């Protein structure tokens, strides 16, 4: 029975294709081996040794040029011994997605892009591609997925985000994703900025 | 010196199931990412899965998941795959093999073979 | 993404000793310098020879020589001798589906 080593992703869990991302175990109990394991298409354990600094362990993981195995729940488990790796409890659960592998979306904004402060603004995304599911990205990262709907008379597939009243302008971004690939996600909508307009 | 010994030959009938174990020596068991790699008369050769290397767990194929399992046991250092309903056409010589790994999580290629398994599915 | 679907050539192929023969690996999708070349004699397992497209193992002679990227990739063996003679395939480590080429066949004359 060990703390839970705590696992981040440098930039983001959001990852291009063909890109590569930064995984980090930091931990004030110290463990000389880190181990990371993923969940989904490609299951792998992948080990490194832990850097000892000031009084806590880390352990900078590096998944390489961004394909589709390498995307999944990502845990981190560290072990202060060697050989029978006598493990810590799991890492919080990392999910961590590829972009652009699908057609990009589009993202409107109702009432208006640049909205007085206080106006409660819906974002919805759409797209004529049978996306199962929608996610909104604020700034580069955010975690708010909502189920599309069904054919839309227009022909189209949407969800409504209710960002609510906006005080705080900023890029607001789309991507879509299936069911069946619930981690491999599509390219990113064109960038929508709210305005925030305040007297 | 790692190397692998794989179990040997076996003739069973279709319906039947068949267990393949492969022995691991020269490095530590669990270090290791072996997978299992038929060659068929007819198929050139084909990853049927392989094990994850610390906790154990196997991917699957799409073709052969329902059908196959990959276990392994730390103490015996041993792999195993097991092909629940054999048919005519499984008819094949099956090699257990260690995937080397690299960096950015890709594994690069097989380094080690063992000697391979022949199961001949015979009426 | 469906299986990357490897196609190898050529299918087979006579050559004398001394000999250079080159084989080339298609794919589907682009599986950058993820590629591997392998070699099988008969009854003997096969063997790796050339890791991450172009990195030869330890043991490989020189002769044997592999080069490509994206979608297309070849193995070059500038001289043929007895003991290179066997099947040799193309394998895929990028997306889980691992896919082999069918295999060339490298058969000597006499």
């Known amino acids: 029975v060990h703390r839970k080593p705590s696992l981040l992703a440098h930039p983001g869990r959001l990852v291009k294709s063909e890109e590569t991302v930064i995984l980090q175990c930091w931990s004030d109990v110290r463990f000389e081996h880190f181990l990371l394991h993923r969940e989904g298409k490609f299951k792998d354990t992948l080990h490194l040794i832990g850097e000892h600094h000031d009084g806590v362990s880390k352990a900078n993981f590096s998944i390489g040029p961004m394909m589709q195995d390498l995307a999944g729940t990502y845990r981190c488990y560290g072990s202060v011994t060697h050989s029978p790796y006598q493990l810590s409890a799991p890492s919080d659960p990392l999910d961590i997605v590829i972009t652009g592998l699908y057609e990009k979306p589009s993202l409107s904004a109702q009432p208006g892009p640049t909205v007085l402060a206080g106006e409660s603004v819906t974002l919805s995304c759409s797209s004529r591609s049978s996306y199962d599911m929608y996610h909104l990205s604020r700034e580069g990262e955010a975690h708010e997925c909502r189920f599309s709907a069904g054919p839309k008379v227009n022909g189209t597939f949407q969800a409504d985000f209710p960002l609510g009243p906006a005080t705080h302008g900023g890029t607001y971004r789309c991507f879509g994703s299936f069911r069946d690939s619930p981690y491999e996600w599509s390219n990113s909508s064109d960038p929508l900025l709210v305005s925030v307009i305040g007297n | 010196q790692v190397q692998l010994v794989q179990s040997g030959a076996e003739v069973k009938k279709p319906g039947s199931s068949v267990k393949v174990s492969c022995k691991a020596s020269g490095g530590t068991f669990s270090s290791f990412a072996i997978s299992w790699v038929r060659q068929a008369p007819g198929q050139g050769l084909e990853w049927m899965g392989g094990?994850?290397?610390?906790?154990?767990?196997?991917n699957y194929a799409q073709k052969f998941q329902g059908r196959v399992t990959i276990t392994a046991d730390e103490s015996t250092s041993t792999a195993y795959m097991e092909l629940s309903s054999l048919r005519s056409e499984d008819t094949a010589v099956y090699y257990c093999?260690?995937?080397?790994?690299?960096?950015?999580?890709?594994?690069?290629?097989?380094?080690?073979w063992g000697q391979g398994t022949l199961v001949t599915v015979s009426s | 993404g469906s299986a990357i679907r490897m196609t190898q050539s050529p299918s087979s192929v006579s050559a004398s000793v001394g000999d250079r023969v080159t084989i080339t690996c298609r794919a589907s999708q682009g599986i950058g310098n993820w590629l591997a070349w392998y070699q099988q004699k008969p009854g003997r397992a096969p063997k790796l020879l050339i890791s991450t497209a172009s990195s030869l193992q330890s043991g490989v002679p020189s002769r044997f020589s592999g080069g490509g990227s994206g979608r297309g990739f070849t193995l070059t063996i500038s001289s043929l001798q007895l003991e290179d003679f066997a099947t040799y395939y193309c394998?895929?480590?990028?997306?889980?589906?691992?896919?082999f080429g069918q295999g060339t066949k490298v058969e000597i004359k006499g």
């Open positions: 394998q895929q480590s990028y997306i889980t589906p691992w896919t």
């Open positions: 093999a260690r995937v080397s790994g690299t960096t950015g999580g890709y594994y690069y290629g097989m380094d080690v």
């Open positions: 094990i994850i290397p610390i906790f154990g767990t196997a």
